[PDB]
Amino acid sequence: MKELIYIEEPSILFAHGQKCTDPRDGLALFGPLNQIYGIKSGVVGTQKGLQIFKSYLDKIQKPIYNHNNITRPMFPGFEAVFGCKWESQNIVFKEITDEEIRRYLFNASTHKRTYDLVTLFNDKIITANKNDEERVDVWFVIVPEEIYKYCRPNSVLYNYDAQFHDQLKARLLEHTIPTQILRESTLAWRDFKNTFGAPIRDFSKIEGHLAWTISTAAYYKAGGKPWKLGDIRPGVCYLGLVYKKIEKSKNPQNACCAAQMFLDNGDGTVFKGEVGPWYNPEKGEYHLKPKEAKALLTQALESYKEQNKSYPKEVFIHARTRFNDEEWNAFNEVTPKNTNLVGVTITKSKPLKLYKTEGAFPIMRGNAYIVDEKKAFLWTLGFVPKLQSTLSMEVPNPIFIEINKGEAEIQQVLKDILALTKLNYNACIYADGEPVTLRFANKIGEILTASTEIKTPPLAFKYYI
Template sequence: MLFGPFDQMRVRGVKNIGIIGTKKLREQMIKYLKKINSPVINSDANIARPNFPGLETVFGISINFDNIIQIDIKDNDIEKYLRYTDSHQRVHNWVNLYVDPLIAYSEKEEMPVDIWFIVIPESIYQFGRPNSKIPKSAENINIGLKKQERNSTQLDMFFQEEKEQLREAYEFEVNFHNQLKAKILSAKIVTQIIRESKITYRDIFSQKQIEEEQKFDTSKAWNISNTLYYKLGGLPWKLGDVRDGVCYLGLVYKKTESDSKSKNACCAAQMFLDSGDGMVFRGNVGPWWNPQSGEFHLSEQDAFEIISQSLDSYYYKFNDYPKEIFIHAKTYFDNVEWKGFEEAVKGKSQIIGVRIKENSAFKIYRHSSYCVPRGTMMQYDNSKAFLWTKGFVPRFKTQIGLETPNPIDIAITRGNADIDTVCKDILSLTKLNYNACIYGDGVPVTLKFADSIGEILTAGKDIKTGVLPFKHYI
């Protein structure tokens, strides 16, 4: 609010945006963007949510309202697919309503769009998620394939083309957000999905709900503006005292099949630089899941390849290799995969493995009106410690959250490093959630988005993507 974003001299000025949605929602989105171009004042002075001075005032960017690219989605099409009882068919068709014209625009039109706002109605939010079922109705449409027909390779005598189109829907996860992000990864289209009720709640909520929701008007303005700025290529903030030549990798695993006995999983790595920005490297799908131990472990070759990708990207950016690479994971590293990691960094960097997991075994209380300070560390071994990433913040003279916080359990499991330094780094990495204007998360960003990135990478069969910035996944 006082000094502007970190990249204010690099990302500034008028930006071209696109909006895709129904006519009503596009109009509402433009109305909302004009609203946050001006100050947004907190309706409840007793709640510690700062006022928002306005998009251009804070971030130095403005929207070209005279030339907003708009793509229309017909209400009738959304309503038609809403009646589909098969959730795979319903969500697949909904996603394609948005994805097909977005990809067509990126391939055929010359006017560049810096970011697309995808505005969805509440019906898509409600019935575009896993396990969602539409209410029974005589108007419902039963279109789909039985389970034994979905993966069939046998040619049908009739309606072969129609059945192939239906089969495609079962290759994707029933999740509108993840499926949409996955389908546009290869096109490198930057998007922000906006839910109808978040910008039009005064039109659809009761008076009591409106009074509660408007308390968050300033928070939403900060969050949307902050993620907009980041997705336009700017860093809202940067850590003040990061160590040079250090990068952090968060390993991402996601099972590709729901069968509990299946070992197949997708692996990816999130690399975070000293700037706090991130890149995602997709690894191979393989038998990385061990049902007995409940852990994921790579083969030596795949461990070598995914670290090599990360090192090559770092070298391309800085013309040198990092001095240290810290690999963060929720489980221990086995000897086979660690050998692959070490081979990849030989003669280039020092590598350290850190296991991070949330711990609810005990709490620390103190004789005070507030809980334990955020940043408290209790070392219980040469390479192990508990770290409180939530709690009382002396600078704010208050605590984040109302509960007595739990610590996270940190252990250096491979390589050599100072536990005090490792804990300081991890505490810093809790401040890098650019997707929301949050001072400090409970877990470091290396693990914060691991699950969501894994879900996008496995939201469809054979998702094609190269090395992409973090902004394409959030």
């Protein structure tokens, strides 16, 4: 009669080699592993967006509270949590004229409006950082709410993407500029109400999470590392491989695969997987032909050699589709004899809703259900006692894992993907269902698919999230 084995909650390092389990509390108690000297904020938008951003930044400077620190901890101030200084001075601001917005408004199809506005923001940023002597580590794009609302892809009065920030980061990728788009209603909800007379973007109780996420994104895009993983073996390389497909009309989507790589720290070195005009969208089974497979493997091995000087002893591959024999055979012979290759598939569509007899509490996060040596389940979502709440909503749903090829311990990959689920940077949540190698996967695929015209994307992460 089977049971559910337990996997311990993974730990994340912090300042002075300190080990915690929560990123927010660990940051508030210890801070980052490595310090940066200071950041300089740059903003593009109207003067209303400028004063809104200034008000929100000085509010962030103050220690702000929430309902209770058990679930949503209070913000102790950016200086006290990161050791870096944020100021409302030495800020570079570029204004966008609302008359140009009015001129661009009355166009017929919203796609060309999206294109011209995105290009205007792009070359405004390029002009701003190519003439101004003051260095800007992070540019803050304060998009207006009505631009996000009335210029939607299906709003009613080809490689370019209709999403604003997708095209923004895609065409800003070719100049190595860390940018972060800020929606106006997110940080101007005080004066923003709905038609009834209520803030539909309400943060009357929850703005501490907003401050936490914004602050950690600003520190991460600056260059400093907020937190890393605790235990990494000498010679293990994670390869979270993207298998997200776009629906790019009659243009051959084929395989828009990319790959994330974690080797020694939380550093991600994404190298662009090929578009690969083989296997036209009628053939979308993600079966990688051997030349591109060995090219991607060579990219991963060369990055590992550049960052580590030593040959890896084991390659961990994370994906979401089934793996065919010839792809793994191509993956095998390039790898040396000493190393090991194993592939893991993560999926959500498998239903398994574990309910509770008494009380109204969900499955505690960390339970592992083992069906066979190959197939297993991991409950990365649900209740966690450090939070005293559930990270999931209603009933949590697990991620069905399955090792295809190669010999490895199932609990080893279970705890390893559990550790990989803790490295979310864009949102400072405790954990997410999909691992961060798969969480960043869809977004970075959307970034790369919005600009075919690039050929060597930077392998950092500041220009993506």
